[PDB]
């Protein structure tokens, strides 16, 4: 189709305008005195939310160029929330700040490529300063504290998370489910988690978490690329009886197969979800068997001459629950017999002895850690279904935060960490003046979050920011109480992972837009 | 009347657009391969010129704001031509360059006041480097050389100027008049010059020199402020009868008096020109008498009770010619008797002996030096009236240039001097980053003249400019021959006073416009 | 007032469009098969003419920029007609050709200044080739022939001019007046001519010749610059009585004085014309006296303390007629007494003996040559007033042509001389490629006249032009008879001065316009 | 051959005396030789340096001497590791000239209406 092409400043201003609509819409929710955004549905009453992720999802602009701008920031900003479970809004606010001053510089005559390098250098330096400022989170006392803070000052949640990590470890897999009653429950069952997400966002049945949940599903394990639905009919019909969901773990699912599964599942004829098999090559084949042994199913390998048409319900494995998001898939409580699993774990441990390479042993040690490690299940209890679902949400959110805290620690929240690091990089310089400007652009951008939070509170941002710079360490401004002091002590903090991710992703998109000279899109026609 | 008010960038862009029209029209004539500008003169066929001063005079824009911009640069740029007799076009090109980059910086967020200070610092430093680069012009050989170059390689003119300065000295008064025949003539006649210009630019009858020339005029000497024309009627009627011009030397001429003289003179009923009396206070009264004794007139002092109504032709003094520009007044060949002048000279010499103060003696020494000094007159000869007028013009122009060369010397022309000084100020810095930008704005602007000259020649400016910076001293590019070398030796040079004035004035207006936040003018109605 | 400014190509295209209107309108009359142009008159029926000068004078465009273009070409093209009495149309066609291809080159990326230099070099070379191709015109037989050809093959006119030049010389002053009867007459009266034209084109009363004629006028001689009309009143009133015209010969006439004279004369209040005094400085003073002695008037010198208010009719000189054009002024039959004139001639001859310098002698010899030389007067006779005026016109035109022929000779006409010279400069080159283009632009432009003439005839220009180049010398195409041969022999020729001036002026303006980057004019 | 668009500007510099059968063909030659500077000039432009200056300096050298846009240093391009298969540069130029030659010699175009 005929395209509309724009260049230089004309394109960059369009891109910026789009990012402003996105940022200006999400940044109203930032801080403890954040405002509400009303999202229309028409299929009912409008939604009122302070969740910047919810707002961002809805943002799409009519102007094709402006839209491209907003969609580029959204994409990258969302990755921050996927990594640490928070920071999408922060990343968006940072991106806006970097792009705004960045383009101003480009217009002044600065070299875009140098500006980018200046920014990137300021960021790498900022991340290093974040590590220095970071406070560890190791002992269970700390884990409980971070969990409590992340749970809106609920000591219960903090305790639950602490106990859960004490069973499966810090690197262990932890899941959250609905409670059976008032009492909370914690059990460790046979399960596994691998880094593979849904193959289509249309499988999502829990839009709130943006994940796919399957109750008592069958699991198909095929070591082939499924492209046609013809070979699936016999298995789909067998799953259509007994009325249970189906998880397809194959080398890949594409073409007609994927499409048909996407449609049929949305029509509600058969609940199905598909994900790629973990790893690649020989390792993929081996891990598919790990899943098989764990779920008590048999792998349908065309390599040995098996067909998918000859696949019976007996060939399918099964578990109690499956949780699939954009990046990970979690199998909970496999039907695999303890004898069979322990048997394969011992088999792999034998392979660790015969291992010649260190690499080979580390990869095997990873597979045994999954199979033997299991999965922790937290059943959140309450009086009332409403209270139960609500608490469950806080537990899931607090869990993600705590995990991130155990990885890289915690730093002052309220956007203090960023303005602190920025203040320590005043003497940072580059190879030329253009890069120097890029550095200053980034350092001034790191004040955006704090200033926005203060603004929402109705206080003078410049004054607060100026005072916070005066102090050192995790000294900052508690926007909630309007008191200065140690942010960590006051309980206002963020996982170092969150702040880091937000900044790095923000700078990623910002750097790309600053170095854009041409945009191509379709015509309004 | 109702006013139209603009602020900030809105105002500055309007101002800039106006300066561009001015600059872009004048800078096409810059250099030896300068282009022609066609100026329409409805009364007759159009004028074709390469004189940037002629072009500038005609520039007036429809948009009131844009016009204000062009008129501000015109006013200040003309002052460079009034001081050194050249550099108006160079100043205009510089002004454009400083304003353009200056406003770009302001839009970037730079502090206007700091930009100005940065610019001014770069200029003061540039002027000092210009002094260092300057080559003196003292000996008559050099004076003849500079005069020849300024006369378009006419050795005759160089000689004439050299001889004239050898009679009256380097600080001597030299005038140029029409020749009586083929032979050139040099004589010293009774005359004086004082630092007072026309009271209205509407007295100008010689627009190219931008001066007022009166042939065999009467001179009125009144020690009072003339505000009404009623008191002038009897004198104006007496002057209307001898069919001769009138120059009025009074304390001041304002109000109706000035207006009536402006109109009546433009109508051509009676040629009249007015200037203030030289000096102030008691000294003014004394110098008015010097003029009286010299012109053979009587001064009409209201202090003793004399009135302007009883002023007869006998009270008025007279000379052969009077030349008046924006700054100076020159009376040539007064009718005063030798006995009367020598009488007052001896009288003042008596006051030098009674002088108690050094200051008082120096002021008296100045008035005797004028009365006794006289004026040197160069009569330019030729074979034709056309050739005579033409040569006379080159002599007048070469005279101004040579005088300026004797004051501050000469530097490389073709805009080399500017790019040379700029290259020596790379390490110049200010108090903050904003000032640093201001410095770089000015240094980059100093390349405008050269680059423009090269552009008119059809060569790559960036390459030539780059090569010129590579050299040192008065090494540059001769745009005429396309050869590099010593500019002074090749005969391409400019009085150090010209280049200096052009830059300082250019920076003056540029600095004012950069620090403008509001503009007020009338409505299009 | 606010101005409208244009730059670069935007300005040059406007300028070109204006030149095309001018050129396209005038070039239709070029050649023996030239077309008519109808010029509208506010009062009366329209004028039908083949005179490109008449057409040019009427051309003025509504677009201010386009107009500037047309007026620039007009101004310079007219100078060619002032110099040789012909070639304004030719200059206009050349200008068009040079500008058209010139701008095309500029747009191609060629350097305007180099293009100009290339053109100028081609012209200087072309002028030299014109001199070489030129055929002298010295003997009376030749003078009569050139005069006859310029008079539309009238042997009578050729003879008249020949006789006239035989009396006063080749550098003599010759005038033409109305005849008193059928017989032509030729007499030499005391008169003088100096190189000073009218100070305002509004003094023109004979628009055909573009000159000013005054019958039995008074002559005011003042050695001062007249700027006010106050000092003229007493003299103007005295001239208003006796109802005769007034010629003002002063150092200069400007400001109110000039304006008032311009208006009063166009209102018919009193017929007045003003010109500057000849020469400058001391020489000017001396020549004013020559005119005084010749016209029998007195010079009003303010230097000795004379005033213009005390000027009587007795102080004014008088002649039988005065002819003033843009460049020259001619005083015919002064009332000065023979004793007074012969007296001053002898006085000047005495100054020649006391002359130390050669320059001084030459200048004195020039003044005596005017006073003693006199002026030849040709009274054109005919049977009817209509035939008399008609013949008089042909005599005046043929006279100018013959004069120009005696100065620089004659070359082939019909635009052959230009195309001939062009063909001999094929190997001419410049300092760079841009200059080379400039040269070719000029050489190709020199074919414009011939091609236009052939076009008006309805023949293929490229074919004729191609054939003419094939020959040599004054071999060309007679557009009238459609036969090739020696142009001079066939009687188709132009004064070398005409063709030269036309080309040089054409290239002058063309060069200026090609090197124009800005234009300034008033708003609509 | 040297990369960074040096090879093209180098070859072009060695063909200054190349002439054709008439002036028009001579212009065509100059058009091509000036066009071979496009790649380098563009690369330099993207780097934020003066193309005319760099191009001018590269012509000054000989062989595979050029400008390393990355490091801003001049020298042997092959040694510095900036190069392109001779087949690439050749193909790029020949195909570029192919279409360019066809469009220059186009007098008519036929296409459907906006409907
Ligand atoms: Mg979260
Ligand atoms: Mg004629």
Residue B241: CB atoms within 10 A of its CB come to 13
| Structure-block tokens of residue A516 | 């854009």
Cα angle, residue A497 at apex, residues A495 and A501 outer, rounded to 5°: 130
* A neighbour chains, 3+ CB pairs within 8 Å: B, D
Widest CA span of chain A, in angstroms?
73
Facing residues of B477 across strands?
A: B484
Sole residue written with tokens 């792009």: A99
Report which secondary-structure segment, H or E, holds B57.
Answer: helix B52-58
Binding residues of C for ATP: 29-32, 50, 86-90, 414, 478-480, 494
Cα distances from C166 to residues A36, C84, C399, C410, in angstroms, run: 113, 21, 13, 20
A229 with A246: CB under 8 angstroms? no
Output the CA A35–ligand 1 centroid distance in Å.
19
Q: What residues contact C221, with CB distance under 8 A and at least 6 apart?
A: C249, C250, C277, C288, C291, C292, C295, C297, C298, C299, C300, C317
Q: Given CB atoms, is B105 within the 8 Å cutoff of chain A? A: yes
Give just the sign of the alpha carbon dihedral B201, B207, B210, B216.
Answer: negative
Work out the angle between the directed axes of helices A155-168 and A140-150 (0-180°, nearest 10). Answer: 130
A177 with A318: CB under 8 angstroms? no
- Site from B97, B101, B107, B108 to mutate, A interface, most A CB atoms within 10 angstroms: B108
| Structure-block tokens of residue C277 | 């005094």
Q: What is the resolution of this structure in A?
A: 3.2
B19 with B510: CB under 8 angstroms? no
CA D8/CA C510 separation, integer angstroms? 41
Question: C174-178 and C375-380: which strand pairing?
Answer: parallel
**Which of A262, A339, A237 is CA-nearest to residue A294?**
A339
Which letter does DSSP use for residue A86 in this model?
-
Give A435 to chain D, closest Cα distance, Å: 13
CA C485/CA C468 separation, integer angstroms? 9
DSSP D71-100: TTEEEEHHHHT-B--HHHHHHHHHHHHHHH
Taken as a whole, chain D contains a residue count of: 115
CA C376/CA C169 separation, integer angstroms? 10
Q: What residues contact A249, with CB distance under 8 A and at least 6 apart?
A: A219, A220, A221, A222, A274, A275, A276, A277, A288, A291, A329
Cα distances from C43 to residues A352, C47, C207, C210, in angstroms, run: 120, 11, 16, 20
Buried b (16+ CB within 10 A) or exposed e, A214-230: beebbbbbbbbebeebe
Residue B490: CB atoms within 10 A of its CB come to 19
B130 with B70: CB under 8 angstroms? no
CA A197/CA B420 separation, integer angstroms? 65
The radius of gyration computed from the CA coordinates of chain B, to the nearest angstrom, equals 25
C457 with C423: CB under 8 angstroms? no
Sole residue written with tokens 């009359």: C29
Output the CA C52–ligand 2 centroid distance in Å.
12
| Structure-block tokens of residue A158 | 């903090």
Cα angle, residue A350 at apex, residues A345 and A355 outer, rounded to 5°: 120
**Which of A262, A498, A292 is CA-nearest to residue A403?**
A498
Facing residues of A252 across strands?
A: A225
Which letter does DSSP use for residue C409 in this model?
-
Buried b (16+ CB within 10 A) or exposed e, C74-84: bebbbbbbbbb
Sole residue written with tokens 């010649």: A356
Helix (H/G/I), strand (E/B), else coil: A321:
strand
Report which secondary-structure segment, H or E, holds B167.
Answer: helix B155-168
Report which secondary-structure segment, H or E, holds B486.
Answer: strand B483-486
CA C1/CA C521 separation, integer angstroms? 10
Q: What residues contact A200, with CB distance under 8 A and at least 6 apart?
A: A258, A261, A262, A274
Rounded to an integer, what is the distance from CA A173 to the centroid of its chain? 16
B468 with B474: CB under 8 angstroms? no
Q: Which domains does chain A have, with CATH numbers?
A: 1-134+410-524 (1.10.560.10), 135-190+372-409 (3.30.260.10), 191-371 (3.50.7.10)
Helix (H/G/I), strand (E/B), else coil: A79:
helix
Which letter does DSSP use for residue A300 in this model?
B
Buried b (16+ CB within 10 A) or exposed e, C390-429: ebbebbbbbbbbbbbbbebbbbbbbbbbbbbbbbbbeebe
Which letter does DSSP use for residue A256 in this model?
H
Taking CB atoms and an 8 Å cut-off, how many pairs form between chains A and D? 5
C247 with C321: CB under 8 angstroms? no
Contact residues, B window 62-91, toward C, CB-based 8 Å cutoff: 62, 67
Residue C204: CB atoms within 10 A of its CB come to 18
Cα angle, residue A312 at apex, residues A310 and A317 outer, rounded to 5°: 125
| Structure-block tokens of residue C253 | 């006439």
Cβ–Cβ gap A114/D47 under 8 Å: no
Cα distances from D112 to residues A2, A4, D109, D115, in angstroms, run: 15, 20, 10, 8
Give A119 to chain D, closest Cα distance, Å: 18
B152 φ/ψ angles, rounded to the nearest 5 degrees:
70, 45
Where residue A281 falls (left for φ over 0; alpha for ψ -120 to 50; beta otherwise) is left
CA C499/CA C507 separation, integer angstroms? 12
Which letter does DSSP use for residue A45 in this model?
S
Cα angle, residue C10 at apex, residues C5 and C14 outer, rounded to 5°: 90
A296 φ/ψ angles, rounded to the nearest 5 degrees:
75, 30
DSSP chain D: -BTTTHHHHHHHHTTTT---SSHHHHHHHHHHHHHTTHHHHHHHHHHTS-HHHHHHHHHHS-TTEEEETTTTEEEEHHHHT-B--HHHHHHHHHHHHHHHHHHHT----------
DSSP B376-411: EEEEE--SSHHHHHHHHHHHHHHHHHHHHHHHH-EE
**Is A241 annotated as belonging to a binding site?**
no
B52: nearest CA partner in chain C: C518
Give just the sign of the alpha carbon dihedral A28, A30, A33, A35.
Answer: positive
**Which of A136, A137, A150, A124 is CA-nearest to residue A503?**
A124
Helix and strand tally (H, E) in chain C? Answer: 19, 19
CA A319/CA A298 separation, integer angstroms? 14
Helix (H/G/I), strand (E/B), else coil: B323:
strand
CA C212/CA C196 separation, integer angstroms? 13
Buried b (16+ CB within 10 A) or exposed e, C172-189: bbbbbbebeeeebeeebb
B130 with B518: CB under 8 angstroms? no
Q: Given CB atoms, is A504 within the 8 Å cutoff of chain D? A: no
Say whether the C–A interface has 3 or more Cβ pairs within 8 Å. no
Report which secondary-structure segment, H or E, holds B292.
Answer: helix B281-295
Q: H/E/C letters for each residue in C333-373?
A: EECCCHHHHHHHHHHHHHHHHCCCCHHHHHHHHHHHHHHHH
| Structure-block tokens of residue C208 | 């055909």
Question: C191-194 and B36-39: which strand pairing?
Answer: unpaired
Q: H/E/C letters for each residue in C165-228?
A: HHHHCCCCCEEEEECCCCCCEEEEECEEEECCCECCHHHCCECCCCEEEEECCEEEEEEEEECC
Q: H/E/C letters for each residue in A480-509?
A: CCCEEEEHHHHCCEEEHHHHHHHHHHHHHH
Chain breaks in chain C (C to N over 2.5 A) after: none
Cα distances from B12 to residues B19, B107, B435, B516, in angstroms, run: 11, 10, 20, 7
CA C25/CA A158 separation, integer angstroms? 99
Helix (H/G/I), strand (E/B), else coil: C523:
coil
A16 with A69: CB under 8 angstroms? yes
Chain breaks in chain B (C to N over 2.5 A) after: none
**Which of B447, B477, B379 is CA-nearest to residue B177?**
B379
Work out the angle between the directed axes of helices B448-457 and B88-108 (0-180°, nearest 10). Answer: 120
CA C60/CA A166 separation, integer angstroms? 101
A486 with A411: CB under 8 angstroms? no
C110: nearest CA partner in chain B: B458
Report which secondary-structure segment, H or E, holds C71.
Answer: helix C64-84
| Structure-block tokens of residue B219 | 């001179």
Q: Given CB atoms, is B104 within the 8 Å cutoff of chain A? A: yes
CA dihedral B486, B492, B494, B496 (to 10 degrees): 10
C514 φ/ψ angles, rounded to the nearest 5 degrees:
-65, -25
Q: Given CB atoms, is B38 within the 8 Å cutoff of chain A? A: no
- Site from D43, D45, D46, D48 to mutate, A interface, most A CB atoms within 10 angstroms: D48
Output the CA A86–ligand 1 centroid distance in Å.
5
**Which of C294, C290, C278, C276 is CA-nearest to residue C351?**
C290
* D neighbour chains, 3+ CB pairs within 8 Å: A, B
Cα distances from A18 to residues A13, A14, A15, C61, in angstroms, run: 9, 6, 5, 52
């Amino acid at each position: 189709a005929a395209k509309d092409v724009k260049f230089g400043n004309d394109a960059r201003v369009k891109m910026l305008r789009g990012v402003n609509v996105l940022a200006d819409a999400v940044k109203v929710t930032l801080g403890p005195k954040g405002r509400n955004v009303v999202l229309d549905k028409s299929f009912g009453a409008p939604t009122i939310t302070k969740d910047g992720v919810s707002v961002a999802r809805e943002i799409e602009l009519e102007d094709k160029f402006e839209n491209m701008g907003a969609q580029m920031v959204k994409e990258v900003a969302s990755k921050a929330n996927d990594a640490a479970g928070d920071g999408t809004t922060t990343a968006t606010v940072l991106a806006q700040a970097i792009i705004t001053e960045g383009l101003k510089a480009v217009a002044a005559g600065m070299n875009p490529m140098d500006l980018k390098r200046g920014i990137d250098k300021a960021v790498t330096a900022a991340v290093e300063e974040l590590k220095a400022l970071s406070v560890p989170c190791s002992d269970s006392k700390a884990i409980a504290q971070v969990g409590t803070i992340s749970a809106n000052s609920d000591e219960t949640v903090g305790k639950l998370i602490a106990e859960a990590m004490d069973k499966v470890g810090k690197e262990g897999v932890i899941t959250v489910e609905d409670g059976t009653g008032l009492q909370d429950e914690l059990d460790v069952v046979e399960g596994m988690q691998f880094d593979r997400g849904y193959l289509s966002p249309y499988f999502i049945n829990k839009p709130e978490t943006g994940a796919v949940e399957l109750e008592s599903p069958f699991i198909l394990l095929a070591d082939k690329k499924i492209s046609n639905i013809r070979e699936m009919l016999p298995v789909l019909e067998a799953v259509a009886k007994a009325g249970k969901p189906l998880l397809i773990i194959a080398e890949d699912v594409e073409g007609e197969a994927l499409a048909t599964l996407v449609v049929n599942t949305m029509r509600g004829i058969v609940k199905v979800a598909a994900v790629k098999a973990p790893g690649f090559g020989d390792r993929r084949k081996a891990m598919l068997q790990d899943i098989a042994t764990l779920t008590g199913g048999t792998v349908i390998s065309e390599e040995i001459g098996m067909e998918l048409e000859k696949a019976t319900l007996e060939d399918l494995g099964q578990a109690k629950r499956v949780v699939i998001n954009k990046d990970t898939t979690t199998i909970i409580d496999g039907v695999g017999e303890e004898a069979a699993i322990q048997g394969r774990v011992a088999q792999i441990r034998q392979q660790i002895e015969e291992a010649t390479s260190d690499y080979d042993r580390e990869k095997l040690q990873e597979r045994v850690a999954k199979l033997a490690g299991g999965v922790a299940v937290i059943k959140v209890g309450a009086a009332t279904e409403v209270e139960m679902k609500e608490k469950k949400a806080r537990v899931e959110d607090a869990l993600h935060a705590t995990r991130a805290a155990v990885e890289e620690g915690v730093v002052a929240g309220g956007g203090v960490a960023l303005i602190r690091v920025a203040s320590k990089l005043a003497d940072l310089r580059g190879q030329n003046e253009d890069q120097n400007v890029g550095i200053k652009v980034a350092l001034r951008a790191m004040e955006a979050p704090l200033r926005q939070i203060v603004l929402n509170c109705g206080e003078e941002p410049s004054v607060v920011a100026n005072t916070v710079k005066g102090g050192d360490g995790n000294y900052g401004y508690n926007a909630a109480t309007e008191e200065y002091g140690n942010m960590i002590d006051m309980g206002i903090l963020d996982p170092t992972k969150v702040t880091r991710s937000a900044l790095q992703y923000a700078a990623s998109v910002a750097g790309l837009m600053i170095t854009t000279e041409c945009m191509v899109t379709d015509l309004p026609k």
